Design an enzyme around this catalytic site. Structure first.
Site, PDB file in Angstrom:
ATOM      1  N   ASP A  57      -0.302  -7.674   1.993  1.00  0.00           N
ATOM      2  CA  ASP A  57       0.193  -6.297   1.952  1.00  0.00           C
ATOM      3  C   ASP A  57       1.702  -6.206   2.200  1.00  0.00           C
ATOM      4  O   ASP A  57       2.183  -5.539   3.132  1.00  0.00           O
ATOM      5  CB  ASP A  57      -0.619  -5.386   2.877  1.00  0.00           C
ATOM      6  CG  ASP A  57      -0.291  -3.908   2.742  1.00  0.00           C
ATOM      7  OD1 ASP A  57       0.074  -3.470   1.626  1.00  0.00           O
ATOM      8  OD2 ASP A  57      -0.329  -3.215   3.750  1.00  0.00           O
ATOM      9  N   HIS A  69       0.845  -1.212   0.000  1.00  0.00           N
ATOM     10  CA  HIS A  69       0.000   0.000   0.000  1.00  0.00           C
ATOM     11  C   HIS A  69       0.883   1.268   0.000  1.00  0.00           C
ATOM     12  O   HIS A  69       0.407   2.295  -0.452  1.00  0.00           O
ATOM     13  CB  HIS A  69      -0.960   0.043   1.216  1.00  0.00           C
ATOM     14  CG  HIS A  69      -2.149  -0.886   1.175  1.00  0.00           C
ATOM     15  ND1 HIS A  69      -2.877  -1.103   0.005  1.00  0.00           N
ATOM     16  CD2 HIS A  69      -2.762  -1.544   2.192  1.00  0.00           C
ATOM     17  CE1 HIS A  69      -3.887  -1.889   0.345  1.00  0.00           C
ATOM     18  NE2 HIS A  69      -3.851  -2.202   1.645  1.00  0.00           N
ATOM     19  N   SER A  87       3.195   2.384   8.669  1.00  0.00           N
ATOM     20  CA  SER A  87       2.950   1.243   7.754  1.00  0.00           C
ATOM     21  C   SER A  87       4.261   0.733   7.126  1.00  0.00           C
ATOM     22  O   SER A  87       5.153   1.538   6.816  1.00  0.00           O
ATOM     23  CB  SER A  87       2.011   1.682   6.643  1.00  0.00           C
ATOM     24  OG  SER A  87       0.873   2.251   7.245  1.00  0.00           O
ATOM     25  N   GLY A  88       4.376  -0.580   6.960  1.00  0.00           N
ATOM     26  CA  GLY A  88       5.577  -1.208   6.399  1.00  0.00           C
ATOM     27  C   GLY A  88       6.704  -1.472   7.368  1.00  0.00           C
ATOM     28  O   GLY A  88       7.673  -2.138   7.014  1.00  0.00           O
TER      29      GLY A  88
HETATM   30  N1  LIG Z   1      -2.366   0.414  13.985  1.00  0.00           N
HETATM   31  C1  LIG Z   1      -3.250   1.040  12.985  1.00  0.00           C
HETATM   32  C2  LIG Z   1      -2.478   1.669  11.815  1.00  0.00           C
HETATM   33  C3  LIG Z   1      -1.161   1.314  11.489  1.00  0.00           C
HETATM   34  C4  LIG Z   1      -0.487   1.950  10.436  1.00  0.00           C
HETATM   35  C5  LIG Z   1      -1.135   2.965   9.705  1.00  0.00           C
HETATM   36  C6  LIG Z   1      -2.462   3.345  10.024  1.00  0.00           C
HETATM   37  N2  LIG Z   1      -3.202   4.381   9.372  1.00  0.00           N
HETATM   38  C7  LIG Z   1      -2.922   5.019   8.200  1.00  0.00           C
HETATM   39  O1  LIG Z   1      -1.938   4.750   7.525  1.00  0.00           O
HETATM   40  C8  LIG Z   1      -3.832   6.138   7.698  1.00  0.00           C
HETATM   41  C9  LIG Z   1      -4.729   6.855   8.533  1.00  0.00           C
HETATM   42  C10 LIG Z   1      -5.544   7.903   8.043  1.00  0.00           C
HETATM   43  C11 LIG Z   1      -5.487   8.301   6.694  1.00  0.00           C
HETATM   44  C12 LIG Z   1      -4.590   7.600   5.868  1.00  0.00           C
HETATM   45  N3  LIG Z   1      -4.322   7.794   4.564  1.00  0.00           N
HETATM   46  C13 LIG Z   1      -3.422   6.950   4.115  1.00  0.00           C
HETATM   47  C14 LIG Z   1      -2.888   6.895   2.731  1.00  0.00           C
HETATM   48  N4  LIG Z   1      -3.328   7.723   1.762  1.00  0.00           N
HETATM   49  O2  LIG Z   1      -2.002   6.083   2.490  1.00  0.00           O
HETATM   50  C15 LIG Z   1      -3.024   6.155   5.122  1.00  0.00           C
HETATM   51  C16 LIG Z   1      -3.790   6.566   6.355  1.00  0.00           C
HETATM   52  C17 LIG Z   1      -3.105   2.691  11.080  1.00  0.00           C
END
Ligand SMILES: NCc1cccc(NC(=O)c2cccc3[nH]c(C(N)=O)cc23)c1
Length: 228
Positions: free
Chosen positions: A89, A41, A183-184
């Protein structure tokens, strides 16, 4: 990371900052000398922008002797990943050359035995993701120790309502959590990489929406094929 603290500088040498046009985008984990594991993602809608990996970092902006920004030869998302799903993912990034290794840059051994982590095992997640609801970004690496949540509780109607497959794992998200920009990144349990942060379920810090992590052992064959 919400509810965490500043990490001890270079104490997590496997920690990578996956960047797009010189900006931190996602966390990553050095899994081999020339390969960084992250989330698919992350690469979404990046098609055109420059993707680089920053290794040996604590601070995103300040000079550090161990800091080195690497260009990417190949970006390999999992073939079964899709924008509208939380499944498969995973992303593998091949650096332009093998990383110069040392006390602040080292790959992390990753889990190859496909069996669940015990409920409640305390796991470490680090990142440069947002630190509050306003979206403040930290200059330096943050971390939090999170207990593993059993899949059945995680799969309750009140929680992720049957979305947690055998290839996914959960960790508590009560006040302490991974969030946007995390993330990642790696979920490390007993010194071994167990999971990769997924932004599948986007809300941060809500106990009724646990953190979701892709289980690396469930993708052991895919990781080996790509590296080969
Ligand atoms: N432990 C829960 C957890 C872990 C890692 C990441 C996330 N939450 C997001 O990453 C996120 C949140 C809001 C808008 C967003 N927009 C985008 C995007 N356009 O990529 C991502 C997000 C949640």
């Amino acid at each position: 990371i919400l509810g965490g603290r500043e990490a001890e500088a270079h104490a997590r040498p496997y920690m990578a900052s996956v960047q797009l046009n010189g900006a931190h985008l996602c966390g990553g984990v050095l899994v081999a000398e020339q390969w960084v594991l992250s989330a698919a993602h992350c690469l979404e809608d990046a098609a055109d922008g420059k993707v680089q990996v920053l290794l040996g970092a604590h601070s995103l902006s300040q000079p550090e002797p161990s800091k080195r920004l690497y260009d990417v030869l190949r970006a390999v998302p999992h073939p079964d990943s899709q924008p509208d799903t939380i499944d498969h993912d995973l992303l593998l990034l091949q650096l332009s050359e093998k990383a110069t290794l040392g006390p602040a840059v080292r790959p992390l051994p990753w889990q190859r035995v496909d069996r669940d982590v015990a409920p409640g095992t305390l796991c470490d997640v680090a990142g440069w993701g947002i630190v509050n609801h306003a979206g403040r970004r930290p200059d330096s690496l943050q971390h939090v120790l999170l207990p593993v949540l059993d899949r059945a509780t995680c799969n309750r109607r009140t929680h992720h309502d049957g979305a947690i497959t055998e290839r996914l794992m959960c960790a508590e998200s009560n006040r302490r959590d991974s969030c946007k920009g995390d993330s990642g990144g790696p979920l490390v349990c007993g010194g071994v990489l167990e999971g990769v942060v997924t932004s599948g379920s986007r809300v941060c810090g809500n106990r009724k929406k646990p953190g979701i992590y892709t289980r690396v052992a469930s993708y052991a064959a895919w990781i080996d094929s790509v590296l080969a």
